[PDB]
Ligand SMILES: Nc1nc2c(ncn2[C@@H]2O[C@H](COP(=O)(O)OP(=O)(O)OP(=O)(O)O)[C@@H](O)[C@H]2O)c(=O)[nH]1
């Protein structure tokens with residue numbers, strides 16, 4: 001029907017995961033804390049993953065939205081992380097992180113809710129194991 | 139870069155601002171705060187042909203038609219006419235919005251979006267939607283709440299503008315974060331937020 | 344529709360030849376600056392008696408709003424202000440300021456605001472906060488109509504408006520002249536349940552309402568029950584318009600409960616309300632129980648079934664002053680429509696119901712044989728003499744036949760006509776320069792063949808005389824044509840005939856040429 005207005009040649013797609021190993025990948029919902037209104041606002045729904053690099057040897061939490069495939073959470077794991085269960089609700093975790101999703105660092109309290117409880121337990125165990133591996137390197 | 143001024147038009151209370159916010163932040167603004175004038179929101183998508191940007195002019199549906207708002211439509215290249223599935227009065231106005239758009243911009247990809255398809259008491263049905271057949275439009279059911287076909291309109295508009303029928307979204311060009319940085323001056327404040335974070339429940343329905 | 348004529352009468356009642364309404368409707372003025380509103384303020388100042396101000400279809404900025412408010416400060420007789428759609432294009436930082444400035448101007452002026460319309464302005468909670476100051480103040484103790492259609496208030500705006508209305512009623516009662524609202528039009532604002540309940544509470548205080556419109560508010564049954572309970576108190580209700588909400592079934596039952604106790608309702612619009620064929624039965628019972636003065640009742644697109652439709656029709660028929668019933672869009676069978684029509688015509692009306700249009704359930708001889716325009720061209724310049732040479736000109740009959748065949752393919756195309764005319768000239772030049780050739784015989788045969796004259800042996804005539812007439816017209820202007828055959832052609836061309844009136848232009852040109860000589 002309508003004639004084209006702009007022609008774009010096909011380009012290669014490079015996602016920063018070729019040289020990293022996926023130690024975890026599960027469906028989840030990510031919520032960001034909104035201090036101005038003091039209520040949780042949905043940040044997205046998608047596959048949250050805990051990637052680990054081989055040479056640089058760093059652990060990175062990554063997440064992409066469902067259909068648009070935008071990055072809704074992306075940060076590094078540090079010994080100062082305080083992942084802990086959320087008293088209200090169930091099978092949910094909360095932690096503060098210097099998220100680098102949109103355009104720059106922002107200190108955000110992220111709450112992740114999984115489908116069931118065993119998945120959340122596995123995620124917490126992997127998080128703790130990554131923290132311990134980072135700490136023991138010293 | 140590539141920019142395609144998109145115009146989001148529809149009756150008041152249909153979900154234009156909620157649609158744009160769910161696209162650019164992922165949240166779900168369940169409060170009805172009527173948009174005044176026009177709001178410009180850039181949405182950056184990545185496709186197999188590279189990155190594109192849609193400058194969504196979310197217009198206010200409460201205003202009347204006429205030339206007073208033609209400033210919104212000047213130099214437009216794609217339009218999304220949004221109507222509420224659970225309200226026939228809002229569907230009766232789709233012809234008026236289409237006429238108002240084609241008055242200023244004659245031939246442009248126009249997508250009809252039926253919003254709020256997750257509610258059980260549905261008034262407008264797939265059989266009664268006959269306007270898009272008379273003209274040359276693409277009709278899509280969307281739901282900014284449950285994320286049902288909430289990116290199909292943008293995909294179709296990109297397909298018709300770029301000119302590649304087989305265009306589809308690629309994952310992302312996301313690279314590693316620059317470096318961990320913290321400011322101990324405000325660090326305590328951050329902790330305080332967590333002390334309140336655990337004291338509120340997630341918006342779970 | 345009696346509503347149209349009622350509105351027409353109301354509009355007629357408020358037209359004056361002088362000292363009346365001042366309007367700017369349909370001017371698209373962009374009052375973006377104080378100076379840019381110089382004409383508007385100058386016109387407002389130069390007005391003897393002001394009793395209405397329309398600013399529809401304009402764009403009032405903050406500075407223009409302040410200037411107009413300062414101008415209005417003088418006008419103390421103002422009683423109405425239709426400000427429908429006077430902020431098209433302004434952002435959120437410019438509407439509340441302008442609205443507050445206008446409210447302050449009216450308050451300091453000392454008006455009475457019998458009517459206050461703000462339809463089609465994108466306000467939301469911000470605009471509601473903006474004009475709440477005007478609504479509460481003494482300028483709206485006498486207010487009788489408050490049209491806020493399509494203001495897009497929302498839940499917060501609805502709550503604020505309800506609080507303002509309650510405070511205004513309290514202050515007015517304290518003064519001694521309680522607020523008596525008559526028409527309230529708040530549609531398309533998404534007052535889903537909190538706003539609807541707040542406004543129902545506001546209505547419960549005021550017992551003077553007569554009309555209430557809340558279409559397209561996304562109200563569900565939990566709020567509609569409260570709205571119906573609030574309506575029940577008001578005994579003077581006349582129009583109950585709640586088009587395009589969601590009553591399901593509980594809402595319809597609650598509405599029937601109040602309709603039982605109301606005895607002055609005249610219009611009941613419940614289109615697109617999803618009554619679902621049970622609330623239809625409840626409403627039918629309520630109206631049957633007694634509800635005179637009813638003029639309209641709309642249940643279109645309520646997904647009503649056949650039996651409930653028949654029940655409501657039977658209940659409605661007993662009404663005396665019924666003037667319109669709508670059931671289009673309900674899932675009525677094709678036989679259901681016929682049954683409903685039969686039931687209605689069993690009564691006097693028989694036509695009150697609206698149309699149920701939406702329901703669900705070497706080659707010279709070869710050319711001469713069959714002459715054609717293109718075949719003549721192929722001969723080239725040879726056609727000038729080839730036709731003349733081939734034709735036997737001793738006998739006028741063959742000359743006439745050749746002339747007719749040549750002229751039959753005559754066309755207005757420049758190349759073809761010239762070839763035809765030169766061929767004809769050559770043929771007649773060879774024909775007329777023969778002692779053994781009587782011209783009168785040729786003319787008589789030509790007239791006979793064209794049908795203008797009859798013959799001893801009936802030779803079949805030709806169909807179209809355009810070509811022969813054009814060829815004759817050309818021939819008459821040549822020298823070889825005798826000056827004695829002109830009268831015969833003139834007499835038989837002015838001679839009436841059906842075959843000639845078909846080609847009027849050729850006949851007229853030939854006659855002019857003949858009268859030249
Ligand atoms: N149930 C349901 N409600 C929705 C959905 N999408 C939007 N809504 C509701 O619709 C309302 C739309 O609000 P807004 O988008 O901010 O208003 P708008 O669409 O811009 O309308 P205007 O500002 O007047 O042009 C929201 O308050 C939501 O509660 C949906 O997918 N499902």
Ligand SMILES: [Mg+2]
Pocket residue numbers: 154155171172173174196197198199
């Ligand atoms: Mg809006």
